[PDB]
Enzyme design. Sequence first.
Site, PDB file in Angstrom:
ATOM      1  N   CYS A 131     -11.558  82.972  42.838  1.00 19.76           N
ATOM      2  CA  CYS A 131     -11.609  83.805  41.672  1.00 19.76           C
ATOM      3  C   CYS A 131     -10.207  83.851  40.973  1.00 19.76           C
ATOM      4  CB  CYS A 131     -12.060  85.204  42.060  1.00 19.76           C
ATOM      5  SG  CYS A 131     -10.818  86.182  42.982  1.00 19.76           S
ATOM      6  N   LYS A 139     -27.969  90.629  37.736  1.00 24.06           N
ATOM      7  CA  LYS A 139     -27.792  89.149  37.847  1.00 24.06           C
ATOM      8  C   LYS A 139     -29.047  88.382  38.278  1.00 24.06           C
ATOM      9  CE  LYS A 139     -22.826  89.484  38.319  1.00 24.06           C
ATOM     10  NZ  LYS A 139     -21.651  89.277  39.214  1.00 24.06           N
ATOM     11  N   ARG A 182     -15.487  86.546  27.520  1.00 25.10           N
ATOM     12  CA  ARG A 182     -16.414  85.789  28.367  1.00 25.10           C
ATOM     13  C   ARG A 182     -17.668  85.481  27.544  1.00 25.10           C
ATOM     14  NH1 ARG A 182     -18.373  88.950  33.485  1.00 25.10           N
ATOM     15  NH2 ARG A 182     -16.324  88.429  34.382  1.00 25.10           N
ATOM     16  N   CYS A 224      -9.857  90.231  46.308  1.00 23.89           N
ATOM     17  CA  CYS A 224     -10.344  91.546  46.697  1.00 23.89           C
ATOM     18  C   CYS A 224     -11.812  91.435  47.129  1.00 23.89           C
ATOM     19  CB  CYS A 224     -10.149  92.550  45.566  1.00 23.89           C
ATOM     20  SG  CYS A 224     -11.539  92.663  44.399  1.00 23.89           S
ATOM     21  N   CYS A 257     -16.256  87.793  43.788  1.00 20.05           N
ATOM     22  CA  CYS A 257     -16.551  87.008  42.592  1.00 20.05           C
ATOM     23  C   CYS A 257     -16.697  85.473  42.796  1.00 20.05           C
ATOM     24  CB  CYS A 257     -15.511  87.312  41.495  1.00 20.05           C
ATOM     25  SG  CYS A 257     -15.369  89.040  40.955  1.00 20.05           S
ATOM     26  N   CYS A 295      -6.332  90.008  36.714  1.00 20.22           N
ATOM     27  CA  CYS A 295      -7.379  90.880  37.270  1.00 20.22           C
ATOM     28  C   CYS A 295      -6.804  92.234  37.689  1.00 20.22           C
ATOM     29  CB  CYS A 295      -8.076  90.293  38.492  1.00 20.22           C
ATOM     30  SG  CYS A 295      -9.431  91.390  39.054  1.00 20.22           S
ATOM     31  N   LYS A 313     -24.260  96.163  36.098  1.00 17.10           N
ATOM     32  CA  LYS A 313     -24.588  94.760  35.894  1.00 17.10           C
ATOM     33  C   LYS A 313     -25.821  94.327  36.715  1.00 17.10           C
ATOM     34  CE  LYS A 313     -20.577  93.993  37.802  1.00 17.10           C
ATOM     35  NZ  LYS A 313     -19.276  93.240  37.974  1.00 17.10           N
ATOM     36  N   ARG A 323     -26.499  89.838  32.963  1.00 15.37           N
ATOM     37  CA  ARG A 323     -25.375  88.894  32.900  1.00 15.37           C
ATOM     38  C   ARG A 323     -25.933  87.478  32.650  1.00 15.37           C
ATOM     39  NH1 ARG A 323     -22.512  92.495  33.136  1.00 15.37           N
ATOM     40  NH2 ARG A 323     -20.584  93.198  34.172  1.00 15.37           N
TER      41      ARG A 323
HETATM   42  C1  SRM Z   1     -14.572  84.813  36.179  1.00 17.52           C
HETATM   43  C2  SRM Z   1     -15.423  85.466  37.298  1.00 17.52           C
HETATM   44  C3  SRM Z   1     -14.993  84.770  38.671  1.00 17.52           C
HETATM   45  C4  SRM Z   1     -14.843  83.248  38.738  1.00 17.52           C
HETATM   46  O1  SRM Z   1     -13.868  82.758  39.418  1.00 17.52           O
HETATM   47  O2  SRM Z   1     -15.662  82.526  38.109  1.00 17.52           O
HETATM   48  C5  SRM Z   1     -15.368  86.913  37.714  1.00 17.52           C
HETATM   49  C6  SRM Z   1     -14.186  87.654  37.426  1.00 17.52           C
HETATM   50  C7  SRM Z   1     -14.161  89.099  37.476  1.00 17.52           C
HETATM   51  N1  SRM Z   1     -15.131  89.894  37.901  1.00 17.52           N
HETATM   52 FE1  SRM Z   1     -16.767  89.267  39.025  1.00 17.52          FE
HETATM   53  N2  SRM Z   1     -16.489  87.428  38.317  1.00 17.52           N
HETATM   54  C8  SRM Z   1     -17.383  86.473  38.322  1.00 17.52           C
HETATM   55  C9  SRM Z   1     -18.610  86.461  38.978  1.00 17.52           C
HETATM   56  C10 SRM Z   1     -18.942  87.414  40.070  1.00 17.52           C
HETATM   57  C11 SRM Z   1     -19.930  87.235  41.139  1.00 17.52           C
HETATM   58  C12 SRM Z   1     -20.704  86.007  41.414  1.00 17.52           C
HETATM   59  C13 SRM Z   1     -21.995  85.823  40.838  1.00 17.52           C
HETATM   60  O3  SRM Z   1     -22.322  86.565  39.933  1.00 17.52           O
HETATM   61  O4  SRM Z   1     -22.604  84.925  41.372  1.00 17.52           O
HETATM   62  C14 SRM Z   1     -19.880  88.442  41.949  1.00 17.52           C
HETATM   63  C15 SRM Z   1     -20.658  88.751  43.165  1.00 17.52           C
HETATM   64  C16 SRM Z   1     -22.134  88.990  42.951  1.00 17.52           C
HETATM   65  C17 SRM Z   1     -22.295  90.480  42.688  1.00 17.52           C
HETATM   66  O5  SRM Z   1     -22.173  90.831  41.475  1.00 17.52           O
HETATM   67  O6  SRM Z   1     -22.514  91.232  43.675  1.00 17.52           O
HETATM   68  C18 SRM Z   1     -18.862  89.206  41.257  1.00 17.52           C
HETATM   69  C19 SRM Z   1     -18.489  90.585  41.649  1.00 17.52           C
HETATM   70  C20 SRM Z   1     -17.651  91.528  40.857  1.00 17.52           C
HETATM   71  C21 SRM Z   1     -17.578  92.991  41.110  1.00 17.52           C
HETATM   72  C22 SRM Z   1     -18.278  93.698  42.237  1.00 17.52           C
HETATM   73  C23 SRM Z   1     -19.638  94.100  41.618  1.00 17.52           C
HETATM   74  C24 SRM Z   1     -20.446  95.088  42.418  1.00 17.52           C
HETATM   75  O7  SRM Z   1     -21.539  95.482  42.018  1.00 17.52           O
HETATM   76  O8  SRM Z   1     -20.038  95.491  43.483  1.00 17.52           O
HETATM   77  C25 SRM Z   1     -16.660  93.484  40.095  1.00 17.52           C
HETATM   78  C26 SRM Z   1     -16.123  94.882  39.807  1.00 17.52           C
HETATM   79  C27 SRM Z   1     -17.131  95.818  39.249  1.00 17.52           C
HETATM   80  O9  SRM Z   1     -18.195  95.416  38.687  1.00 17.52           O
HETATM   81  O10 SRM Z   1     -16.848  97.013  39.444  1.00 17.52           O
HETATM   82  C28 SRM Z   1     -16.366  92.278  39.313  1.00 17.52           C
HETATM   83  C29 SRM Z   1     -15.423  92.296  38.177  1.00 17.52           C
HETATM   84  C30 SRM Z   1     -14.682  91.125  37.678  1.00 17.52           C
HETATM   85  C31 SRM Z   1     -13.447  91.224  36.780  1.00 17.52           C
HETATM   86  C32 SRM Z   1     -14.086  91.325  35.359  1.00 17.52           C
HETATM   87  C33 SRM Z   1     -12.432  92.340  37.035  1.00 17.52           C
HETATM   88  C34 SRM Z   1     -12.722  93.638  36.204  1.00 17.52           C
HETATM   89  O11 SRM Z   1     -13.700  94.364  36.425  1.00 17.52           O
HETATM   90  O12 SRM Z   1     -11.954  93.944  35.296  1.00 17.52           O
HETATM   91  C35 SRM Z   1     -13.087  89.813  36.804  1.00 17.52           C
HETATM   92  C36 SRM Z   1     -11.956  89.308  35.929  1.00 17.52           C
HETATM   93  C37 SRM Z   1     -10.940  88.367  36.476  1.00 17.52           C
HETATM   94  C38 SRM Z   1     -10.130  87.736  35.320  1.00 17.52           C
HETATM   95  O13 SRM Z   1      -8.906  88.046  35.205  1.00 17.52           O
HETATM   96  O14 SRM Z   1     -10.645  86.848  34.580  1.00 17.52           O
HETATM   97  N3  SRM Z   1     -17.024  91.168  39.754  1.00 17.52           N
HETATM   98  N4  SRM Z   1     -18.400  88.629  40.138  1.00 17.52           N
HETATM   99  C39 SRM Z   1     -16.835  85.393  37.606  1.00 17.52           C
HETATM  100  C40 SRM Z   1     -17.622  84.291  37.220  1.00 17.52           C
HETATM  101  C41 SRM Z   1     -18.516  85.299  36.157  1.00 17.52           C
HETATM  102  C42 SRM Z   1     -19.457  85.260  34.844  1.00 17.52           C
HETATM  103  O15 SRM Z   1     -20.262  86.167  34.483  1.00 17.52           O
HETATM  104  O16 SRM Z   1     -19.488  84.419  33.919  1.00 17.52           O
HETATM  105  S1  SF4 Z   2     -12.957  89.222  43.442  1.00 19.42           S
HETATM  106 FE1  SF4 Z   2     -11.640  90.852  43.011  1.00 19.42          FE
HETATM  107  S2  SF4 Z   2      -9.793  89.870  42.589  1.00 19.42           S
HETATM  108 FE2  SF4 Z   2     -11.258  88.331  42.401  1.00 19.42          FE
HETATM  109  S3  SF4 Z   2     -11.693  88.321  40.299  1.00 19.42           S
HETATM  110 FE3  SF4 Z   2     -13.132  89.577  41.320  1.00 19.42          FE
HETATM  111  S4  SF4 Z   2     -12.356  91.575  41.073  1.00 19.42           S
HETATM  112 FE4  SF4 Z   2     -10.705  90.226  40.680  1.00 19.42          FE
HETATM  113 MG    MG Z   3     -19.321  95.878  33.375  1.00 20.37          MG
END
Ligand code: SRM
Ligand code: SF4
Ligand code: MG
Length: 564
Positions: free
Chosen positions: A430, A214, A62, A476, A480, A436, A212, A131
């Site tokens: 997502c 943001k 990324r 889930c 994201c 994932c 993380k 991030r």
């Molecule tokens: C690619 C991306 C989604 C998308 O369709 O674009 C994404 C994909 C994943 N996110 Fe996310 N997140 C992405 C933005 C987000 C956002 C949105 C935002 O930032 O506006 C959120 C919600 C806001 C937030 O953080 O509360 C989001 C909340 C999560 C979480 C829950 C975090 C938490 O604190 O509760 C996880 C899991 C974790 O961190 O434990 C996570 C983890 C993941 C993982 C890396 C799974 C993992 O931990 O191994 C993802 C990989 C999927 C794959 O196979 O590529 N991602 N994730 C995201 C765009 C990200 C970037 O940095 O460039």
């Molecule tokens: S929302 Fe859940 S399933 Fe979707 S990319 Fe994030 S961690 Fe994976």
């Molecule tokens: Mg991390």
Amino acid sequence: KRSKVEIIKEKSNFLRYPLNEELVSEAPNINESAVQLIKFHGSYQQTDRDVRGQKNYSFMLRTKNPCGKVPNQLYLAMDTLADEFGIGTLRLTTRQTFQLHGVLKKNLKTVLSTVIKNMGSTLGACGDLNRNVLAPAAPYVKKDILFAQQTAENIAALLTPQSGAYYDLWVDGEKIMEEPPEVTKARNDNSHGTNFPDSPEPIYGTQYLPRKFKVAVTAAGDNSVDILTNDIGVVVVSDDAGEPIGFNIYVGGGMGRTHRVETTFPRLADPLGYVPKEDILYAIKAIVVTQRENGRRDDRKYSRMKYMIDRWGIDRFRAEVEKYYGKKFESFRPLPEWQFNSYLGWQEQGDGKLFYGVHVDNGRVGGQAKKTLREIIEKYNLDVSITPNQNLILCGIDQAWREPITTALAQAGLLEPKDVDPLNLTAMACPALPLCPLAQTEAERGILPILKRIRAVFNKVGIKDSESVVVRITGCPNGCARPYMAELGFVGDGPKSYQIWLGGTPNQSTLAESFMDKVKLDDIEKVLEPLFTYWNGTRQEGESFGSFTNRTGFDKLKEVVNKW
Ligand code: SRM
Ligand code: SF4
Ligand SMILES: [Mg+2]
Ligand SMILES: [Mg+2]
């Protein structure tokens, strides 16, 4: 009491060990310590969940791109890497970055150093760190948009890891070709005990952040960035002549929650206060430091800044931040209503050139679409920018290029907004399965057939095909694709089911709520048909589905669904 990740960070020599030794082992994967560390370097070890039996290990990468801005040279390098070393696709993200999936362990250093030597970085794209910083994606030359963008760049730079581990591992310490002095001076400042002045990480320290972090920057009115979901939202405030004077600030948003654990929840960021423009980087550090020193490190479910703010309340939090800022926040100033902007279609920059926003479903750039986008970007030597709705903007286009670019895009199936279902324009999913590891079900690979089923429900009910609702789907509850802000959110809660969320609005100014659990994929019409019939039958003139939901309330909507 401290999490496993804390100890890993402590014993890593600022993100180096044992990642350094694991990267050269013969195995196709790396050990658990290295799995956690590599995230800080912008890579995730994954396995393909479709292919039965064996563990097919690969690495997702990324990028870090403040404001979504991608120089020509980087786009070309990424496009080629995806084909040579990945699985033929680039994935545009909800934070204005690229992911590149499928890279084998043995090619990982080749890939990352190529990124690094082509005007890019993956440092801090994952990890317990700042991030990608969001900003308005459109390349307007208007002063306050340019100022929002400069500020996001400066914040990203401020909160860049300084340890040198990144270049040590990926380019054997060599030097690659300057930050504004305002950044350097802010980072160095320790008049209020914010820093660790003898540490290789003067802001992050040995332990980095609890999780993380943001940030999103924008100008008044423009909520492309979905500002309320972030740890910090920053809004440019300008005088009557359009000259920036300072920033409103918000704090403590987040989407992430866990099914059946009610002490986890999404949260909107609170209005915190205003600061004059010269203070922004000092106020940002103060906030970051307050999270650094006080966010929980025992249980990672409760570590994001939204929780400390929920526990302390916004006033106690403000007071704490003000000790590191060294002065008081002013009162938050009034702002105009938020508006969503897609930046899609043909528009003017304001300098004589056009820009074109390209609609991409789920940000997945592949096949002919990928090939055509590369030909255009390379032939016209375009810089581009990534939007938080997973779309791509082609910048710096001459008027004479508009027709041939248009013709090429159309030939590859890349349509202008007027020829795309309005459901798709505002939809997001997502990646979820197959790579994932937290996915419970499909999102990206299920959303398109869901949208067609929604359009078929509209048709059946008698809704016009120019009407729409914001549809966001995750695999889930991590959120994201920011589903908890949707007019219609589907959040994976079993192998073939979704939790449905209602109450988001078209400009992402409201938080949705949980409406029904475990709606099976096959049954969604049983829920959506009554909802949309009632909306169609009793909405006020031009009332959005989200506003209608919030006005009507869940008791009456459930009754309508139950009597169907
Ligand atoms: C690619 C991306 C989604 C998308 O369709 O674009 C994404 C994909 C994943 N996110 Fe996310 N997140 C992405 C933005 C987000 C956002 C949105 C935002 O930032 O506006 C959120 C919600 C806001 C937030 O953080 O509360 C989001 C909340 C999560 C979480 C829950 C975090 C938490 O604190 O509760 C996880 C899991 C974790 O961190 O434990 C996570 C983890 C993941 C993982 C890396 C799974 C993992 O931990 O191994 C993802 C990989 C999927 C794959 O196979 O590529 N991602 N994730 C995201 C765009 C990200 C970037 O940095 O460039
Ligand atoms: S929302 Fe859940 S399933 Fe979707 S990319 Fe994030 S961690 Fe994976
Ligand atoms: Mg991390
Ligand atoms: Mg899109």
